[PDB]
Amino acid sequence: MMTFADKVIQFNKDLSYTGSTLPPGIRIMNPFKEHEQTMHIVEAFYHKYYNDNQSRYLILGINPGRFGSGLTGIPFTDPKRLITECNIPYSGKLSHEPSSVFIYEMINAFGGAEAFYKQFYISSPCPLGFTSIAANGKEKNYNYYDSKALEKAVYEFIIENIRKQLTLGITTDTCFCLGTGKNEKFLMKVNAQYKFFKRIVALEHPRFIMQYKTASKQFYIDKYISAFKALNNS
């Protein structure tokens, strides 16, 4: 497929879980197979912002959840941000993702969605999410690292996903890791094993910022932008 967008679109169309049997109670959550609207949004978004053959720097989150961006298929882009920031329509119930608020405030501070997505491509080590439903009926979303059993089950699936993302046309000098906790530890172990990237720069995850550093959101905006500028400076 010719453009960056074409390749991302085909990746998302073809994505299916190929890892090992998951722990009890956990179901794969594949945003591109959940609702028919998701792949239509995927096509609209990537054809808008990735309609070229320029390389991109990779930013890695953790993994999708069912809510928010899980309803759009677009990383850190919940329905409201899809409508107001990307000007791409969304039919159905809105779903608030705090991380999405932060990311698009950061993107506007950077110079806007077109400029930012001209330079950066957001993915995650694990491209699928995970859910369980409790006896009370409440639904839980998991990070791939939330238990040794889950991580063991999806480990090779994750490595294969990272390799596949690199085939898109990625400048490998710096990968940005969102999440200074277990995401960082995992990706540092991975990068020491496979040498995907010359270096990894970890930044506080938008969800952490929104939940525990809320009054300080501006500082973290600046921190993100200073990391992207240092990369571009050097």
Strand 139-141 to 174-178 pairing: unpaired
Q: Beta-carbon neighbour count of residue 55 at 10 Å?
A: 14
Range of the domain at 77: 1-234
Q: Rounded distance, CA 86 to CA 84, Å?
A: 6
Q: Are strands 129-133 and 199-203 parallel, antiparallel or unpaired?
A: unpaired
Q: What angle do CA 187, 193, 195 make, to 5 degrees?
A: 80
Neighbours of 217 (CB within 10 A): 16
Q: What is the phi/psi pair of residue 38, to 5°? A: -60, -50
Check if the beta carbon of residue 122 is closer than 8 Å to that of residue 62.
Answer: no
Distance between CA atoms of 12 and 10, rounded to whole angstroms? Answer: 5
Number of domains forming the structure of the chain: 1
Q: In sequence order, what DSSP letters do the residues of the chain get, joined into one string?
A: --SHHHHHHHHHHH----SPPPPTT-EEE-HHHH-HHHHHHHHHHHHHH--S---BEEEE-S---SSGGGGTSSTT--HHHHHHTS-----S-----HHHHHHHHHHHHHT-HHHHHHHEEEE-SS-SEEEEE-TT--EEE--TTSSHHHHHHHHHHHHHHHHHHHTTTB--SEEEEE-TTHHHHHHHHHHHHH--SSEEEEE--HHHHHHHSGGGHHHHHHHHHHHHHHHHH-
Which residues, in sequence order, are bridge partners of residue 201? 176
The number of beta carbons lying within 10 Å of the beta carbon of residue 93 is 7
> Using CB atoms within 10 A of its CB, is residue 3 exposed (0-12), middle (13-18) or buried (19+)?
middle
Tokens of 182: 């277990």
Beta strands 57-60 and 174-178 are parallel
Q: Which of 3, 121, 115 is nearest to 51 (CA)?
A: 3
Interstrand relation of 129-133 and 27-29 (parallel, antiparallel or unpaired): antiparallel
Handedness of CA 93, 6, 59, 15 (dihedral sign): positive
Sequence-distant (≥ 6) Cβ neighbours of residue 136 within 8 angstroms: none
